[PDB]
RNA sequence: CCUUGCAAGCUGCUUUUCCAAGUGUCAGUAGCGGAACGUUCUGUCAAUCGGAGAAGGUUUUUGGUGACAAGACCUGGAGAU
RNA sequence: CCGUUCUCGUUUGUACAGACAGACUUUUGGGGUGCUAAGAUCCAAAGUCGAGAGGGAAACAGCCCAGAUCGUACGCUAAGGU
RNA sequence: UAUUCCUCAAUGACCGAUAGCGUACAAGUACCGUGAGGGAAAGGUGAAAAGAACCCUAUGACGGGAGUGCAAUAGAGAACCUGAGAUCCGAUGCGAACAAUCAGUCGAAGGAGUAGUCAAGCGCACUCACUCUAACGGCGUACCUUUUGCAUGAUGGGUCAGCGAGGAAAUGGGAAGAGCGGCUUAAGCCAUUAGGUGUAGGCGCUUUCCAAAGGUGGAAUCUUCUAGUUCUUCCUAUUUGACC
């Protein structure tokens, strides 16, 4: 039995849950109308989910709103605290320029850049050095904090 | 051990130890009777009788028993009535078997309601052989030559 | 025991050394069977190998009745319980108990008749 | 004995088909000493067998059973049960309602779970003492009698799986194909179900090196 | 009758504690009274609970007073004592019939 | 319940009810319902029989059943009705002694 | 209790007030009267040590 | 089944079992949840059983809460899992 | 605000419902309509049936008593009886 | 890249004679229809025909013997392996023409057939022995469906055997279990006694208000906490014939 792996003796952690087979006998508890009750559309299976009974539904009583700007630009937000945490770990060289390639390679940006990067002010107290950034957008507080530490 | 003795006394029996092959306790019939209480049930027995009781938890096969709750004694000439028991009277017995009875089916059904249940049950019983009744004078041997 | 005479004479332990359904009876043979053999000197216990078959216990009695209890896929304590119930039985047929007080002498003083005077 | 699952490197003897002494090899502990888990092996074996199933099983619906769509008699008046065809699911010779149709039975499994299952299988073989490492798998001839002689020489074995690093040489291929109890695989085809079908595992040094190199390379993503 | 067992064998006076015994069944009664009996701890017929004698308990008893027997500590103790004294062992009776 | 078990339980049934599964299943289920009910009802019937035999035994000596059984209760004699009826049938002199004891315990009115 | 006895096709028979029914009513009255006496005796003050 | 203890492992120093008590609970349609039995087929299985008679069929007996299981005689004549 | 119950039956998240044909009894002494009729009909407040077996009401959905885990040829009671 | 009137080779947790093609058998036949058209049923002696010489009784051997054969109810002439049930005719035991009712159930007199055990004297009383029957007593108005409610004089079923309805895919809402710690690939590609690869994409990190432009300091101070994702099983939903 010590370190045996027989096909004879394999199983999962918990026992397998089996399918509920309706329309079998009385003792199963789901025979004779299964779990459908008596008559109507729902017992005969001709009911569409979301129908509300002929009342004007909420999806048609509320107004439509606005328009969609097809040319909306999406920028990835990065807080200064994430950049500080990656600076202290040696992933980012704080003496060189921090571009969007630098943030993309260390994983501060996720998988898909869309239109660029917006630098944010979350965790800005952890910025203690002059840092130079080249991003697409930047908030007012993040630029204020970075220039207060001698960067740009 | 003393707790089992106390509980068996509550039921109404005392274990005296195993039956030895040297003993001849199964004597011919004597015309006295006793009424004994074992659990809820009462039995009117003479020697050589057999009774099936509810399962006795603290005895084994071929154990000699003393039945401690004797309610009445009788013979051809006198009757001794206990209020409720007779402490001076003893009835001796031997455990013969612990066996399950025949299965009874428990069936329930509610018509037109799609409900039914079927289950079984077997009750365990203890068989005792009554060997000796004490506390009332037995008739003398009338050796009719 | 009927009037002090033990009724079960032979306990046959039928088992398989290969089959998975004989695991419990094999553990019973190793663990609980010597104790039962020791506590019953009046009982003969034979053990029989039956490869490819499901295990059972067989009880042969004084009245030439044989009772077989299949013990396939049982835990060892259930096998020991079945062996104990075979030992404690008188070997009778499993039918309904017609009475709980068997007597051949129902009356010491004579059954009531219309001729009885007080 | 030893505690399996500590991720410790192991030292194994190296031999060949001639029962010679070819030194020793170190087996990487993150491949041959992982904790042994039955549930992962259960899922990997189920994944392999589900991928294997052909699924060429079929029945006919009422659109495919031969028979007319005509109503067999009038809805009312004949005293008989109403039917739309004579090919309904309750009819003899009729359609099969909810019957099988040809489909794939394959399920999905993460790649890392498959790698872990292969690690567990190799660890169990090394832990039982049923893993033999060969310096190479070269045979003098293609005759099956050499393999049969080595198999008879072996100790407490029934079915052997022989793993080669690269593609299998023609001599071993010809020598083992008539034997149901000796089966061969390149290291690219090593799988959990093939390992568990044989109680003894024979791997060359190249096969061990290729498996450890594969497990030490992360999944490219 | 069944109330004959519960008749007072002691004068009824002020008590420190009260014993309440449910002597009526639950179906066919108001759900409020059943919830009150549940708040007294009485769920099954012929069951007895023991409570301190204050107005919060007394109002609950007053609501369901036709379903229960309420006893003082002294009445309950006397009833149990008389029941134990009745079942106590007495000396045997010997009757010699004989001579038909 | 299987078809073979139903045919086992339908043994001795009259007509097609022992033989055909549609007919046998109803009659066997009704038989099992009767068996469940009659395990309860047997105790009522047997207590009625014991009380009838005790009442016949005690009225031979001029004592009604209720006065007799209450006089036995008053003396802490705890023999039950089954054993008392067996005494009334098979040990009439001991039963007469019990009737005398109960009549001294509780004569009743009249 | 049902009190409709001379109308309709569903028979609710009138339960006659026999002496035995009067005896049961008197027993129930004795029980409630003893309960009321206990509540009157115990209602003068509350039990201490709360 | 639950609750309260008890004693064991754990890792969780707290979640799981064994045992003991329980004047604790256990009618049930629609319906919801939990735990199982059996059938066919596949791997385990070039393994195991089979003229020392397979499958299937009739009797009979024993076991489990149940779906059901199992022993033996007879029939059967090559398969069963 | 304070007792009793020690039960979470409370509130709420998530997932799965079924049901939206009710019936009778409580002085016609909670009332409307009807004829102070209906086994009518429509509301209020209880209970039972529905979905509830057992004992009583001759027989009995809805009244009275009372809630069926199983076994016993043990005991005490309810309604109702002797 | 599409398709199969076709050929060759191979495979199947596909079916196994009411299944699988309508057809395992001379089937698009027989049969039905003016016609278009509709459309079956029916497999199995035995290893080998050794397929039963001859006798007896019948008009006549399929019978009773004999013989063949492992086996003859293995004895057939589009059918004989096994040989269930409904159904029909008999044999034995008990009940049965003075007593009524879902045909039972709980008790039970009697009748009939049949075993074994053994201390003491080779009988006899023990195993409530066992099996079948059941005079007589108490209790007992089928089942299913549908209903406020059915013994209902509401529905359905002559009986038996076989068959007969919650099922598949993809995509969502969840639960349980697991892998990894950012997770996971799709088509494809290289191999298949078998896996390995493949980053395009998807979700998360991620920033909350807002129609859009615009705008965006989480919690904590005492070595700081600061994200999920992909599978498997099951319950449900959508689109599909969607329980029949
Ligand atoms: K048509
Ligand atoms: K069919
Ligand atoms: K056909
Ligand atoms: K044959
Ligand atoms: K035949
Ligand atoms: K009868
Ligand atoms: K009609
Ligand atoms: K899903
Ligand atoms: K996870
Ligand atoms: Mg249900
Ligand atoms: Mg049905
Ligand atoms: Mg439902
Ligand atoms: Mg319906
Ligand atoms: Mg509905
Ligand atoms: Mg069509
Ligand atoms: Mg048409
Ligand atoms: Mg078909
Ligand atoms: Mg009427
Ligand atoms: Mg009526
Ligand atoms: Mg009067
Ligand atoms: Mg009364
Ligand atoms: Mg329930
Ligand atoms: Mg057979
Ligand atoms: Mg088969
Ligand atoms: Mg199988
Ligand atoms: Mg509506
Ligand atoms: Mg409505
Ligand atoms: Mg409706
Ligand atoms: Mg309404
Ligand atoms: Mg009203
Ligand atoms: Mg009105
Ligand atoms: Mg009215
Ligand atoms: Mg009405
Ligand atoms: Mg109406
Ligand atoms: Mg209401
Ligand atoms: Mg309804
Ligand atoms: Mg209810
Ligand atoms: Mg009722
Ligand atoms: Mg009645
Ligand atoms: Mg009633
Ligand atoms: Mg209950
Ligand atoms: Mg056919
Ligand atoms: Mg066939
Ligand atoms: Mg066909
Ligand atoms: Mg011939
Ligand atoms: Mg053959
Ligand atoms: Mg044949
Ligand atoms: Mg037949
Ligand atoms: Mg006959
Ligand atoms: Mg006559
Ligand atoms: Mg008639
Ligand atoms: Mg009977
Ligand atoms: Mg009757
Ligand atoms: Mg109607
Ligand atoms: Mg009715
Ligand atoms: Mg009808
Ligand atoms: Mg009707
Ligand atoms: Mg009809
Ligand atoms: Mg059928
Ligand atoms: Mg791929």
UniProtKB/TrEMBL annotation, chain C:
This is Large ribosomal subunit protein mL43. The keyword ATP-binding does not apply. One of its GO terms (cellular component) is mitochondrial large ribosomal subunit. It is found in: Mitochondrion. Belongs to the mitochondrion-specific ribosomal protein mL43 family. GO terms for molecular function: structural constituent of ribosome. SUPFAM superfamilies: Thioredoxin-like (SSF52833).
Automatic annotation (TrEMBL), chain G:
The lineage of its organism: Eukaryota, Viridiplantae, Streptophyta, Embryophyta, Tracheophyta. This is Uncharacterized protein. It comes from Brassica oleracea var. oleracea. The chain holds residues 12 to 61 of 78 of the full protein.
